[PDB]
């Protein structure tokens, strides 16, 4: 919302900040009033670049920095790969070496051509999915579930503490 | 004067000691013999330092192996200067007694800003600026370039110190800060680094808390060398607040914008470095793979690996992501939100920033920023603050909390929101001191009752004794006035604050007390806004003009320059027969910094019990967490915070040399048993039921009579 305005229609960005960026394969600071303008003609084409889009390639995002928008979306996609837990590797260096390669992949995708990254990702898809990728999908789902359970346990304990001290006072 | 203490024989410079001094020395010797941390209170502002220092020196002589050295800390450098003066006098006395020099060293540490000899940094007074300039001059890059001896300003003092002081340490002696500056000038060495090295072999070292509490700078000079040392904190009743401040980090919108600009400059500098010199500075990557100071204490700090951030670009992107998350989280407009662990979890989920890589953020910032050969760290200081916050949050949140304030107090609508990371318990940050050092003595004056302190700070005290000053004459005659001439309650309650009758009672009491009291009087209010409201009411009425006629009136303001000018004029007014009435705030920095002595602040007036506003959400976390853990009632802790502050701001008049003076508290709340009980023992025992709730007129009459009694000689 801190951006000066859209490259084309920098108006709404001044009147109100309600508009949120729209991510695309192009990687852009697109705005809803401008998304309508893209829908009317082209229907999934970047105005200046002209990059084709299958179905408008539009998804909501909330950060004034377009570079952060693209980086966060690319990282979201990448996290689906190389999600194996650290303890799977006993080697000290290998704990974060693969994370280094992951972030290198992210930076490569942000600016440089993604053809090599896609070919490499196909290679990692075939070799790792056989066993480890689906296993770590399961384990990360388990840890998400148990963290939401633990936060609800914390909030049950806080509600019980509030209501029991109230019943202390009234009793 | 050699005192045959029960433990041993202890020298003493002055001729006579009061029985309270005997009690202090015996209790202190008991604690040292037990070799266990403890806390004790002594009334006198001065005299306690000499007794403590003499006992510690005698104990060191008797059992040198038991205690390696003494680490005596004081609130402020102007105060610690008086301590070094006392130590110098004691050493001169002992040296005269022995007839020869002994291998004893005593020194005081202080900031490079306070003491330094470089003309370039001399004109600048801002501490971050001095730190950055000194880092630039002493940088490893500058040292290597000095080896080349190219045409460039190089700070010769550090180089000469490295050449000479490394080989030869200072034999012995006592050096004040000012005298150490002269020694550094004469020897072409650093008064700072020379003392830093002497810490390795020094019998006595003195420096303020922020040199011994904050893990960033405290640890480096408080390394494990002093495994068994007598660490002592003087007048450290406000130790919890400073220990919390050593951890709390405040993030603001302006600071975040400055961080973003600094980060842009960092990126540009990285590009320039890549195009100019790349391989030599890339060797940093190799040493990183092998594996401003970190805020993580000894055991909490970790150095396994930097993490996923292994290159300049990767680290820069990580900081960009975290800064964007903080920016948005702060921009959100809503009620105050608290989230110690939920903040970390939400950060990791929303922006994909794992806590383990986030942990080493500040350390990797230090290393990478060093690689960049920046001009100075002053420009990038906001980024380092944000990095310290980023590493701290990922380090721990069990006894912490992140508070967000989209709207600031005293402003219906302001575009400068603030994110606080205020701590809740000081035990977390003060644990290393207690654990590392065999025994710590928290010697304090005006101490609110000791029982609370073990609860707030997790330690097992050895002795719990309150020492009462005993003199042939009643130096202090405190009183509490709750009933005015109208026989109306004068409590300064929030709902009763607006009461014009109460304000009038305060004004009339001040008028009469200024009429009778001799030159020099200080009145402490509860807040700036309350003080201004009372002053305005008195101005609308004729009371204020009469007070002005009777005696000069000075007022305190938030601005330090005006505060200093007003206090400077107040001192001259006290010296002259005009007199002065200094209105100030209990929480004001002036109240804690200033010390009142004979013919200074003769009658200390306390207008209302000092209570912090019940809306500041930081205190809500700090207080409800104490209720949940350590089991302290909210009202108990609030009244303790009021009584400790009042004792701090009212205990100055009895500084030393047996200078008479009266402490009047114009509030019926102090008459309550709980307030009296929590009041320090020495003041309370002097206080009696006869004068507990004197009317305004009766208090004035008894004050006049007591001043008559104290006027005559011994
Ligand atoms: S190296 Fe020594 S003399 Fe030079 S600026 Fe730093 S403290 Fe001052
Ligand atoms: Zn637009
Ligand atoms: Zn485009």
Swiss-Prot record, chain A:
It comes from the Eukaryota. The modification Phosphothreonine is found at residue 51. GO terms for biological process: adult heart development; DNA repair; G1/S transition of mitotic cell cycle; negative regulation of apoptotic process; nucleotide-excision repair; positive regulation of smooth muscle cell proliferation; regulation of G1/S transition of mitotic cell cycle; regulation of transcription by RNA polymerase II. Its main location: nucleus. Keywords: Acetylation, Cell cycle, Metal-binding, Nucleus, Phosphoprotein, Transcription, Transcription regulation, Zinc, Zinc-finger. The modification N-acetylmethionine is found at residue 1. This is CDK-activating kinase assembly factor MAT1. It comes from Homo sapiens (Human). The lineage of its organism: Eukaryota, Metazoa, Chordata, Craniata, Vertebrata. The gene is MNAT1. The chain holds residues 1 to 171 of 309 of the full protein.
UniProtKB/Swiss-Prot annotation, chain B:
Optimum pH is 6.5 for both helicase and DNA-stimulated ATPase activity. A motif (Nuclear localization signal) lies at residues 668-681. ATP binds at residues 42-49. It is an enzyme of class 5 (isomerase). Binds 1 [4Fe-4S] cluster. Its main location: nucleus. GO terms for molecular function: 4 iron, 4 sulfur cluster binding; 5'-3' DNA helicase activity; ATP binding; ATP hydrolysis activity; damaged DNA binding; DNA helicase activity; metal ion binding; protein-macromolecule adaptor activity. ISGylated. ATP-dependent 5'-3' DNA helicase. Component of the general transcription and DNA repair factor IIH (TFIIH) core complex, not absolutely essential for minimal transcription in vitro. Required for transcription-coupled nucleotide excision repair (NER) of damaged DNA; recognizes damaged bases. Sequestered in chromatin on UV-damaged DNA. When complexed to CDK-activating kinase (CAK), involved in transcription by RNA polymerase II. In NER, TFIIH acts by opening DNA around the lesion to allow the excision of the damaged oligonucleotide and its replacement by a new DNA fragment. This is General transcription and DNA repair factor IIH helicase subunit XPD. It comes from Homo sapiens. The gene is ERCC2.
């Amino acid at each position: 919302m801190d951006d000066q305005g859209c490259p084309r229609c920098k108006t709404t960005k001044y009147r109100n900040p309600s508009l949120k960026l729209m991510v695309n394969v192009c990687g852009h600071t697109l705005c809803e009033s401008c998304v309508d303008l893209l829908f009317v003609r082209g229907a999934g084409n970047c105005p200046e670049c002209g990059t084709p889009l299958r179905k408008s390639n539009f998804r909501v995002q909330l950060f004034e920095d377009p570079t952060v928008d693209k980086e966060v979306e690319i990282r979201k996609k990448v996290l689906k790969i190389y999600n194996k837990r650290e303890e799977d590797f006993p080697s000290l260096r290998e704990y974060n070496d693969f994370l280094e390669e992951v972030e290198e992949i992210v930076f490569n995708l942000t600016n440089n051509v993604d053809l090599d990254n896609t070919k490499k990702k196909m290679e990692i898809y075939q070799k790792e999915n056989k066993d480890v990728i689906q296993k770590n999908k399961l384990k990360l789902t388990r840890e998400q579930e148990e963290l939401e359970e633990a936060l609800e346990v914390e909030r049950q304990e806080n509600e019980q503490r509030r209501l029991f001290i109230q019943k202390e006072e009234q009793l | 004067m050699k005192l045959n203490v029960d433990g041993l024989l202890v020298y003493f410079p002055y001729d006579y000691i009061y029985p309270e001094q005997f009690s202090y020395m015996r209790e202190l010797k008991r604690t040292l013999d037990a070799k266990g941390h403890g806390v004790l209170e002594m009334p006198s502002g001065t005299g306690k330092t000499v007794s403590l220092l003499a006992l510690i020196m005698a104990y060191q002589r008797a059992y040198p192996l038991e205690v390696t050295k003494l680490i005596y800390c004081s609130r402020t450098v102007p105060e610690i200067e008086k301590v070094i003066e006392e130590l110098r006098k004691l050493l001169n006395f002992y040296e005269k007694q022995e007839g020869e020099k002994l291998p004893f060293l005593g020194l005081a540490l202080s900031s490079r800003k306070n003491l330094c000899i470089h003309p370039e940094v001399t004109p600048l007074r801002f501490g971050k600026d001095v730190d950055g300039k000194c880092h630039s001059l002493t940088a490893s890059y500058v040292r290597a370039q000095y080896q080349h001896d190219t045409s460039l300003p190089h700070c010769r003092f550090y180089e000469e110190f490295d050449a000479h002081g490394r080989e030869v340490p200072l034999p012995a002696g006592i050096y004040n800060l000012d005298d150490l500056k002269a020694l550094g000038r004469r020897q072409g060495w650093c008064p700072y680094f020379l003392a830093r090295y002497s810490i390795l072999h020094a019998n006595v070292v003195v420096y303020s808390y922020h040199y011994l509490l904050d893990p960033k700078i405290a640890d480096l000079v408080s390394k494990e060398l002093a495994r068994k040392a007598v660490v002592v904190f003087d007048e450290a009743h406000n130790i919890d607040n400073v220990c919390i401040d050593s951890m709390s980090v405040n993030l603001t919108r302006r600071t975040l914008d400055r961080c973003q600009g600094n980060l842009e400059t960092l990126q540009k500098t990285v590009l320039r470095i890549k195009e100019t010199d790349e391989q030599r500075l890339r060797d940093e990557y190799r040493r990183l793979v092998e594996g401003a100071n970190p805020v993580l204490p000894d055991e909490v700090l970790q150095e396994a690996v930097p993490g996923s951030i292994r290159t300049a670009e990767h680290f820069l992107g990580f900081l960009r992501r975290l800064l964007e998350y903080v920016k948005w989280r702060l921009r959100v407009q809503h009620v105050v939100q608290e989230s110690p662990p939920a903040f970390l979890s939400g950060l990791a989920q929303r922006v994909c920033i794992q806590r383990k890589p986030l942990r080493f953020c500040a350390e990797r910032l230090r290393s990478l920023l060093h690689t960049l050969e920046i001009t100075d760290l002053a420009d990038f200081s906001p980024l380092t603050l944000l990095a310290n916050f980023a590493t701290l949050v990922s380090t721990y949140a069990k006894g912490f909390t992140i508070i967000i304030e989209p709207f600031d107090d005293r402003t219906p609508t302001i575009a400068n929101p603030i994110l606080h990371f205020s701590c809740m318990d000081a035990s977390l940050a003060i644990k290393p001191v207690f654990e590392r050092f065999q025994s710590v003595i928290i010697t304090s004056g005006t101490l609110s009752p000791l029982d609370i302190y073990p609860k707030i700070l997790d330690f097992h005290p050895v002795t719990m004794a309150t020492f009462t000053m005993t003199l042939a004459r009643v130096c202090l005659c405190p009183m509490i006035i709750g009933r005015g001439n109208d026989q109306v309650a004068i409590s300064s309650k929030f709902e009763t604050r607006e009461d014009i009758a109460v304000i009038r009672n305060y004004g009339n009491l001040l008028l009469e007390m200024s009429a009778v009291v001799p030159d020099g009087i200080v009145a402490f209010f509860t807040s700036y806004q309350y003080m201004e409201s009372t002053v305005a009411s008195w101005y609308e009425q004729g009371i204020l003009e009469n007070i002005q006629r009777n005696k000069l009136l000075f007022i305190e303001t938030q601005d330090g320059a005006e505060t200093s000018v007003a206090l400077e004029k107040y001192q001259e007014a006290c010296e002259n027969g005009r007199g002065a009435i200094l209105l100030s705030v209990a929480r004001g920095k002036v109240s804690e910094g200033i010390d009142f002595v004979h013919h200074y602040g003769r009658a200390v007036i306390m207008f209302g019990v000092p209570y912090v506003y019940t809306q500041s959400r930081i205190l809500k976390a700090r207080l409800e967490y104490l209720r949940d853990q350590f089991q302290i009632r909210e009202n108990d802790f609030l009244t303790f915070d009021a009584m400790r502050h009042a004792a701090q701001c009212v205990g100055r008049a009895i500084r030393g040399k047996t200078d008479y003076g009266l402490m009047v508290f114009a509030d019926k709340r102090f008459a309550r048993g709980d307030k009296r009980g929590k009041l320090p023992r020495w003041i309370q025992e002097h206080l009696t039921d006869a004068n507990l709730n004197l009317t305004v007129d009766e208090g004035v009459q008894v004050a006049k009579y007591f001043l008559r009694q104290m006027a005559q000689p011994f």
